[PDB]
Amino acid sequence: TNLVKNKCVNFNFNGLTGTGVLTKSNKKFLPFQQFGRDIVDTTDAVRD
Amino acid sequence: ENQKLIANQFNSAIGKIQDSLFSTPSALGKLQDVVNHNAQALNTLVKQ
């Protein structure tokens, strides 16, 4: 399904399910890692 | 009869108070410990 940003939607990124608002990030990920987590181990960033 | 001396001593003590707090970081340990305890309790609750 097409990507929608700046809107509360139910997302599913390659099996990673959840709900939240998708925005453009300034985080420089590495090619092998896909999604990011904060100190409390919650998903705060993903890759398309 | 010692008004000027007492005033100078009070001014010097007030001036040294700032040094005893700007140089010593563990002087405010109580408030920092309270904040850290609250934050750590929240982090433990969200990590559970």
In angstroms, what is the resolution?
2.3
Closest CA to B28 of B42, B40, B17, B39: B17
* Nearest residue on chain A to B39, alpha-carbon basis: A40
Tell me the DSSP string of A4-48: --SSEEEEEETTEEEEEE---------SS---EE-TT--EEE---
Which neighbouring-strand residues pair with A16?
A: A13
* Number of cross-chain residue pairs from A and B with Cβ atoms under 8 Å apart: 6
Q: Which residues contact B47 (CB under 8 A, 6 or more apart)?
A: A40, A41
Taking a contact as any Cβ pair under 8 Å apart, which residues of chain B between 16 and 45 contact chain A? 43
Q: How far is CA B1 from CA B12, B15, B28, in A?
A: 19, 24, 38
Q: How far is CA A20 from CA A7, B24, B30, in A?
A: 8, 44, 37
